[PDB]
Amino acid sequence: MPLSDSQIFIALFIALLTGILAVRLGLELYS
Amino acid sequence: PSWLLEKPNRLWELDTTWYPGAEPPSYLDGSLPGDRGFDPFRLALPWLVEGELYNGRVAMLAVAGILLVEAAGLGPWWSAPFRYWPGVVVSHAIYAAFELKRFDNFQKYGETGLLGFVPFDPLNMRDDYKRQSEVRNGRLAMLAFIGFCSQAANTGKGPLENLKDHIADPTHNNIFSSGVGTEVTLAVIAITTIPIVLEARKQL
Amino acid sequence: ARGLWLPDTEPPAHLKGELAGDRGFDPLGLGSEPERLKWYTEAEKTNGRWAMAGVAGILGQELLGVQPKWFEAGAKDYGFPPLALISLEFLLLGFLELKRYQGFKKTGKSGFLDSFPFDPANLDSEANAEKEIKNGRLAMVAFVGFVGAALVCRQGPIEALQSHLSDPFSNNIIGSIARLPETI
Amino acid sequence: LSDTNLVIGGATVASLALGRFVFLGFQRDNAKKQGLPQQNGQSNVEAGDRLAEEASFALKTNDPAGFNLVDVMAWGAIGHALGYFILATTSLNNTPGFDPKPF
Amino acid sequence: ATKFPKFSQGLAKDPTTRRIWYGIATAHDFESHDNITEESLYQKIFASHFGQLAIIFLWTSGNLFHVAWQGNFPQWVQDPLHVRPIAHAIWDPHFGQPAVEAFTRGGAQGPVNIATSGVYQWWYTIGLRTNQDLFQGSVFLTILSGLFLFAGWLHLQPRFQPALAWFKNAESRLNHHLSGLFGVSSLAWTGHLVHVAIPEARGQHVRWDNFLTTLPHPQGLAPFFSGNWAVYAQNPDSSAHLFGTGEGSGTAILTFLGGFHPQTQSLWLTDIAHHHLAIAVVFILAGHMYRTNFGIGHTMQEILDAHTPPGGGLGAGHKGLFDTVNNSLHFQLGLALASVGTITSLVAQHMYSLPPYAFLAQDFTTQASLYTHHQYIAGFILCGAFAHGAIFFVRDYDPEQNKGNVLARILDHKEAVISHLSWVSLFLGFHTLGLYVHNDVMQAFGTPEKQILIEPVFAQWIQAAQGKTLYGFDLLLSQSNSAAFSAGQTLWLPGWLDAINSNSNSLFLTIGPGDFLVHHAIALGLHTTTLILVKGALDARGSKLMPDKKDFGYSFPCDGPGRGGTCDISAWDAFYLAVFWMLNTIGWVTFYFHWKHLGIWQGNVNQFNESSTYLMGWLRDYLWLNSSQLINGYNPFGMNSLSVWAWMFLFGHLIYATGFMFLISWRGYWQELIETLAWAHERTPLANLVRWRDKPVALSIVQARLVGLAHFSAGYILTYAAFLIASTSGKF
Amino acid sequence: MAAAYLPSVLVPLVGLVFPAIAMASLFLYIEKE
Amino acid sequence: SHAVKIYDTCIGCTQCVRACPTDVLEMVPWDGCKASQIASAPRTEDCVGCKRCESACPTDFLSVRVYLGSETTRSMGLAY
Ligand code: CLA
Ligand code: CLA
Ligand code: CLA
Ligand code: CLA
Ligand SMILES: CC1=C[C@H](O)CC(C)(C)[C@H]1/C=C/C(C)=C/C=C/C(C)=C/C=C/C=C(C)/C=C/C=C(C)/C=C/C1=C(C)C[C@H](O)CC1(C)C
Ligand SMILES: CC1=C(/C=C/C(C)=C/C=C/C(C)=C/C=C/C=C(C)/C=C/C=C(C)/C=C/C2=C(C)CCCC2(C)C)C(C)(C)CCC1
Ligand SMILES: CCCCCCCCCCCCO[C@@H]1O[C@H](CO)[C@@H](O[C@H]2O[C@H](CO)[C@@H](O)[C@H](O)[C@H]2O)[C@H](O)[C@H]1O
């Protein structure tokens, strides 16, 4: 049984939040 | 800039700023109408003020026309323009003639106006209350047009029928039972958890 | 000399007895830093208060005979779908907890929204603080006991107590672990 | 008083007694010579590690020989491990089909 | 001048293009950055470690997500021997229609890549069955990555910044890592195996919504608490068990059967559960060794200071080594890399011979890819271990603080160590090459019976002692009346002896003279790579040619043409030279693994046994013979799905060759050439309207060695990966 | 696959749009005085 | 710029000064050696780092040492 469109969008949104946290860590490590 | 308020004043709708205890940016000091210190991605300035106003003003007419069309039985609003090349050219020429003066006024006055009535107001009555009401109604109108489009995408019925279905069954006819339910729930959780992360930034 | 968790031991130097519930118990030394100690004091109060509300909720739900048990109440049909429920709950609790943190940052005390402290009946006292913290600790321990009874005996708290009172030499933790194949 | 009760309780009691009466001096003087963990000639708490402060409950006990709570947990852990080793080896050797002996 | 290398004002004031390159290459050498302190260095490293952990968990989440979204995991679960596992989908707008058709495989609706990573076998073994399971795991790991990123940001904030002394508390970190990070994690994994993976192997669907309802064993936890632990070993899965179904299944959860499940050709899951449980208990016990805040436990400085032989054979012994190790991040990283890389090699050697995942042994491409992947990773890590040992000797070693201990004493006889490594390398090279060349000449002259074929009787004796009866040595596990035999006879010996005496698996393969010769080649490679690395580390502080080398640091171009000339004199250059030898060594190892297994998988062991004793046999019957399908991936007649590997094969050859340019031609040629080019641009009309900001210069001497080595290594790896995967997957 | 249009959007984004943005921004950062 | 430090084993032979192609080095009076002079490096801003001076030096080990440092237009030997 395949995944739904909503599951892919959920994963992409959680990854976008994780990427925001990553940018935050990278900027903190920089300065 | 007549869109600037007579006096700097941040209004109160359950709080002053977009979450309780939120700091305001240095460039948002309450001089603008609808100021809530809300620019977390620091996009902001005055060109974006006419951008917000223009999008809001077009959205007022959009939501008014859609609600009036749905109030009568004039079919779906999204299929309405389909119910060509000379017309496209003449409309684009007329609207571009409008936008010529709209863009020219910003180079000199810092405002847009309509043609040369840069404070376009033949009947006066302009005040800070009118400015704040205009910006808040524009924001509400463009949120309402996005709601119209999203409700027409998720359900084939018009916005009046969606309101009737929500009236009939409130807990079962809402966004959290539609196709976009789980991602909306996740966005709500992220939204409600974001300001505590921002306060962790502040206190640390 | 206040009572200590162990008789005739030296408490850590950061526990001199000013806070309510200070029995010198910090064997790991978690509260050695003062600001973290204040935050942990508020956190102990908030966890204990949520435990008191929840333990009273589980007890009242079993006392009033609500048909699904407390550990199966989420799966019940209420008409309201759980996605809408969790979204509205997160909105309301986000408002209330942002207000509570703003009050803790401004004043350093507990309280409801724009009221720090929250005491309209004016019942605040040092003995009352000791009663609050001791009932909170007892309710936290009690909630862990509720989880244990729900996990091993598959029973609510009053049901497990009645089972223990009916036969205490076979209806204890030893017997319930020995009866996991028939329970589960 | 089952076989589990007998083996676990007897091993725990024997370990606690061995730690209390027999090996207390040996453990005490070895822990005295080895001392606190160090870094660059200083204990960890003196070097600036506040989380490495010696736990105040761990020394003073009221036992006349100085047997504290940490000694009870350590020797009881040893006793439980020995008792469960005995019980497990007995369980293996009593189950038919299993024979770990080299002959 | 500029602000990009903001950690180095010396680089920021460089007016040439060297500023950009060196700004990239020195960014993670935090100790050499401007105004760094020890405490801020440790805090930056801690946060960087959080970032790396988040990257790892995101990478795993991406693999799970792409398999769940675009793979064929349920179809593979239905037929694990007849379904090619899909890695991910291909969306390439440069594809022609024949390429679209060729890459559509595995039952996919479009072009896909077939996975070689073995994640299907692993995830299926641990109990995952559906796309929903993989998706939920991927979402959980994305959240874990976000948590790690938040913790990395958090511990950089001033009130959550750990003090320097916290980082140097060795005893508490060792206690916690051994007891919790190793032991409790292994215990929790035993919980997962017992509650989920073992029932799913027996057809029982156990997930989060029903695992509190499902009994892992019919008698519950009473045998555990009573100590009647042999109950959990009763009634194992039978030899006729079908994996993932209840047919032929048992009820045991902790066993010691040994050997393999007959259908999956992999280790029994109940054996794996008992392994991880025993590991959990041993590691939790070992995590109570060191003293923290409770008055008990060992002090490592006193342990080290106590271990000095009273006869004086080791001088001062290990005195002062606690502060030497604890104050040097390079000593710690060198130890960590040496141990982890050796463990990576152990993983490679044990996963092919004792496959732990169901239907992994039958997937030949995956087994070859995993062995090669982990052995090359192990080689790079071992090179890094010795590199950071050399860096320790330059940057962190204090001779006064280590006076007379084992470190100073091994520095004091470095000539003996290096010269003996040179002797063993020379002996192995002379005699291994000589025996191979003698055999090649014997084959060329038509007389293969004149070859020198030395039987590996020592390793055959080892195989006999572990129970392989083929060689006729009757001892220990191959002697039916021995004490070692009788002790294991009721526990693990029946399954182990069934597995080790079968030639249909990879458990202790039959070996002969070809295995002898290639093992001595492997010994030559290990000893020579070690010689280069050890000579680099021990001469890092100085040699007779440059007695003050420590003053110049780990990496510097040379000391000029004086004193005879001093190219490649730095310890860094010894690392650079040793990477070539490591790649050569892992090449020999993996060539051996692949060719021997190719013969075994094709059912013709005589090809390796007869052709591997001479080097033309390797060339013709391994490289030339098995490249035929690969290089026909595209041809004038058309293309197939191996065309990506043919293209990558050539791509690797090209990158390898490009590296030779940086390695052979050196700097001053290019600098004069670039000078003429800079003249040309300034004098060319319509082009001299634009100017460079950074003055173009040739790459530096060290940078050239690095870039040439990087191209050489990348081409090496890409070429062999294409050949390995294409040759194995075109047949299997 | 579900949402099968997503590769046709994200592959040009990750392969062309993001690298162009990245090298333009990084060029502007590393040349800034 | 590169750092050129002089040590006290210098015998004042002047060979490093003669070898230098960018006039970094010069001889100054000294009392530590028989020649009554010592090499000095006052103009290391012009030092290219060729180590011709070290090749010229006769003492064992060297009495002039060049430590390559931060690179400049002058030290990179650029005419453009
Ligand atoms: C495991 C991966 C990893 C981790 C944990 C780090 C961690 C760090 N790096 Mg390293 N980096 C990596 C991979 C990594 N990097 C790779 C593959 C390269 C190319 C070889 C680099 C090249 C690099 C440079 C050139 C610099 C860092 C710097 C940093 C620090 C700040 C990063 C940041 O986001 O600033 C965010 C800052 C901005 C977005 C604006 C400035 C732009 C900076 C100067 C360059 C971009 C840095 C970024 C990490 C490049 C990513 C490379 C990409 C191909 C993966 C931090 C300690 C910087 C630091 O100051 O040194 C301690 C620094 O100058 N990194
Ligand atoms: C007869 C009694 C006896 C014996 C046989 C030993 C034996 C040993 N003791 Mg002593 N010891 C004794 C009595 C004894 N002890 C007594 C009564 C005490 C008082 C309690 C001690 C207290 C003591 C301490 C405190 C320590 C020892 C240690 C040692 C070890 C090293 C000693 C040494 O000097 O190495 C000399 C070694 C060298 C000079 C280096 C040789 C290096 C070779 C040449 C390298 C070869 C590499 C090879 C070529 C490459 C791989 C080969 C390839 C085939 C794989 C050794 C196992 C030490 C230790 O190791 O403990 C585990 C240690 O710390 N002992
Ligand atoms: C096929 C390529 C090749 C060969 C044969 C060698 C050979 C050798 N390497 Mg060199 N290496 C290579 C590639 C090679 N290397 C590359 C690409 C690099 C990267 C730059 C290195 C970097 C390197 C380092 C850094 C070191 C070596 C060392 C060694 C020696 C290893 C010990 C040994 O095997 O002794 C046996 C010797 C040989 C196999 C050489 C050939 C002997 C011939 C066949 C003898 C017979 C000659 C014949 C009769 C004469 C006829 C002449 C005719 C005109 C009459 C050996 C001399 C190590 C060393 O010197 O240890 C002592 C050392 O430290 N290598
Ligand atoms: C992941 C990266 C990626 C992607 C998605 C593409 C996609 C494409 N490439 Mg390939 N390319 C890439 C990387 C990529 N390229 C790299 C790294 C190289 C060098 C190795 C090449 C070398 C290459 C060549 C030599 C050619 C392509 C061509 C094409 C097109 C073939 C399909 C077609 O028939 O279009 C037909 C073309 C059209 C229908 C017109 C498309 C016009 C686009 C949409 C204009 C977009 C505006 C532009 C991107 C503005 C940039 C702004 C800012 C982001 C910088 C397609 C647009 C072929 C071509 O057609 O492109 C010109 C072509 O000749 N590529
Ligand atoms: C201090 C010290 C210090 C040192 O140093 C160290 C150490 C030792 C670590 C420490 C100790 C400690 C302690 C033990 C802690 C623990 C805790 C817990 C118990 C809490 C909770 C807490 C808990 C709480 C929150 C809670 C509760 C919950 C609630 C809300 C809910 C409920 C319920 C309801 C009603 C009903 C339904 O039907 C269901 C539910 C929904 C389910
Ligand atoms: C006071 C007093 C006394 C005493 C007595 C008592 C009271 C005692 C008790 C004590 C005890 C009674 C103790 C105990 C302890 C125990 C412990 C502490 C345990 C632990 C355990 C463990 C650690 C386990 C583990 C494990 C597991 C879990 C699983 C399996 C494996 C093993 C076994 C390892 C006398 C009379 C002398 C005198 C007078 C007074
Ligand atoms: C397994 C063995 C079990 C033995 C344990 C049970 C016996 C002991 C239980 C009696 C405990 C009485 O606990 C007692 O609590 C009171 C408050 O409640 C503490 O009293 C403290 O707070 C009160 C209340 O503000 C103030 O008067 C004052 O600051 C201080 O005395 C005592 O310091 C403690 O001794």
Side-chain angles (χ1 to χ4, degrees), chain E residues 349 371-372 375-376 425 428-430 432-433 436 514-515 517-529 580-596 608 612 615 618 622-623 716 720:
Chain E
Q349 304 276 27
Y371 190 86
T372 305
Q375 287 284 55
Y376 272 105
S425 289
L428 286 169
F430 280 143
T432 310
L433 175 66
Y436 270 120
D515 307 272
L517 290 166
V518 69
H519 265 92
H520 283 81
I522 290 168
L524 160 69
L526 290 185
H527 277 97
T528 311
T529 312
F580 293 102
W581 257 99
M582 170 288 282
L583 285 175
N584 184 57
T585 308
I586 309 302
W588 289 347
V589 169
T590 49
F591 273 35
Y592 173 34
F593 178 91
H594 186 217
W595 195 19
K596 199 184 179 74
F608 182 81
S612 65
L615 292 168
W618 284 84
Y622 178 56
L623 294 187
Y716 205 102
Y720 190 65

Side-chain angles (χ1 to χ4, degrees), chain E residues 414-557:
Chain E
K414 59 170 171 145
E415 294 87 359
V417 175
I418 294 163
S419 66
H420 277 74
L421 268 167
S422 177
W423 173 81
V424 60
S425 289
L426 281 171
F427 172 84
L428 286 169
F430 280 143
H431 291 84
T432 310
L433 175 66
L435 290 192
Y436 270 120
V437 167
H438 171 102
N439 291 350
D440 267 282
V441 173
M442 280 331 113
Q443 295 274 355
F445 287 175
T447 60
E449 72 279 357
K450 294 172 61 175
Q451 287 175 111
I452 299 167
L453 308 179
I454 301 176
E455 193 78 15
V457 292
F458 301 150
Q460 281 166 349
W461 182 71
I462 289 184
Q463 287 195 2
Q466 288 154 179
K468 200 159 150 120
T469 57
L470 179 79
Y471 311 115
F473 307 107
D474 276 280
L475 79 159
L476 300 169
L477 295 194
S478 62
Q479 183 27 281
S480 39
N481 51 48
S482 83
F485 193 97
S486 35
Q489 158 149 63
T490 65
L491 321 168
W492 56 75
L493 268 200
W496 172 263
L497 292 170
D498 169 44
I500 208 183
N501 280 285
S502 144
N503 302 314
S504 59
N505 53 50
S506 272
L507 181 67
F508 283 105
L509 303 170
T510 300
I511 51 179
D515 307 272
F516 175 94
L517 290 166
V518 69
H519 265 92
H520 283 81
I522 290 168
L524 160 69
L526 290 185
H527 277 97
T528 311
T529 312
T530 300
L531 158 72
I532 306 153
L533 286 167
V534 161
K535 178 243 167 294
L538 295 178
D539 288 347
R541 297 173 53 79
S543 61
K544 306 289 304 177
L545 187 47
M546 174 163 204
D548 60 339
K549 200 197 290 193
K550 65 186 167 50
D551 303 343
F552 287 76
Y554 178 61
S555 186
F556 56 95

Side-chain angles (χ1 to χ4, degrees), chain G residues 27-51:
Chain G
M27 297 308 288
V28 315
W30 197 40
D31 77 342
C33 76
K34 161 166 334 173
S36 326
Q37 53 201 114
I38 192 180
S40 166
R43 291 174 290 275
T44 55
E45 71 268 21
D46 300 333
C47 176
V48 293
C50 58
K51 294 172 172 278

